RNA sequence: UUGGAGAGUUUGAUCCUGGCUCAGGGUGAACGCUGGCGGCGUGCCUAAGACAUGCAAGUCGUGCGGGCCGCGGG
């Protein structure tokens, strides 16, 4: 099975005659603390169903992060819309230096040592995907020679 | 490569822009409430305004000639 963290659970609403009607949205990261993470965002008429749906999509969307002593191989910068995430290799003592959103992702991914920074829009959702696509572009010394 | 966390607040809700705000470290500090001990620091940031009183630069008789006192004695 997988380890699971709720990053964001927010209420939205829409208007109608007679009043606002709500809906809930569930940002969930899911991982094995050993190189496999998934991000899922899920909506439903109620809180828990949404969390459940969220967790579901998460598994249906994964990425294999190439750890190396608990740190990523190389520097990576990624922009998703106006959001930017910076990922930077750190040595053993460092810890994970990051805000909650990319923290939850990197920890449950088994990253244990990394320097990060959020730039631009720090909307959680967008920072979330931006951290994902970031990880998803990581390449290994091998990966590269093999390509070239 | 010893190194990099962010949050609140514009909307019915969203994304973005954008300012305000906060958490951190610092000080010749000051103010309040409170206050036992020791060590190293450290203390007129304002009127280079004004200052009573003592003290902060003198020494050599192995450069010189004198007075005053005394010690030694003709
Ligand atoms: Mg790979
Ligand atoms: Mg963005
Ligand atoms: Mg851009
Ligand atoms: Mg390295
Ligand atoms: Mg914000
Ligand atoms: Mg308001
Ligand atoms: Mg407006
Ligand atoms: Mg409101
Ligand atoms: Mg802001
Ligand atoms: Mg006091
Ligand atoms: Mg007192
Ligand atoms: Mg002065
Ligand atoms: Mg005056
Ligand atoms: Mg005066
Ligand atoms: Mg004296
Ligand atoms: Mg002489």
**What resolution, expressed in A, was reported for this entry?**
2.8
DSSP A23-79: EEEEEEEEE-SSSEEEEEEEEESSHHHHHHHHHHHHHTSEEE---BTTB-SS-EEEE
Q: Which experimental method was this entry solved with?
A: X-ray
Question: CA-CA distance, A11 to A26, in Å (whole number)?
Answer: 9
CB A41 within 8 A of CB A24: no
Return positions of chain B under 7 A from a protein CB.
2-7, 12-17
A15 CA to centre of ligand 13 in angstroms: 70
């Amino acid at each position: 099975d997988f380890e699971e963290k709720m990053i964001l659970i927010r209420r939205t609403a829409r208007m109608q005659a007679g009043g606002r009607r709500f809906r809930f949205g569930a940002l969930v990261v899911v991982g094995d603390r050993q190189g496999r993470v998934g991000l899922g965002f899920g909506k439903a008429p109620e809180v828990p169903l949404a969390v459940q749906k969220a967790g579901y999509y998460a598994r249906r969307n994964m990425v294999e992060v190439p750890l190396q002593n608990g740190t990523i191989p190389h520097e990576i910068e990624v922009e998703f819309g106006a959001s930017k995430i910076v990922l930077k290799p750190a040595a053993p003592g460092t810890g994970v230096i990051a805000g909650a959103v990319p923290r939850a992702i990197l920890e449950l991914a088994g990253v244990t040592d990394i320097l990060t920074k959020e730039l631009g829009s720090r909307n959680p959702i967008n920072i979330a995907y931006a951290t994902m696509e970031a990880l998803r572009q990581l390449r290994t010394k091998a990966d590269v020679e093999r390509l070239r």
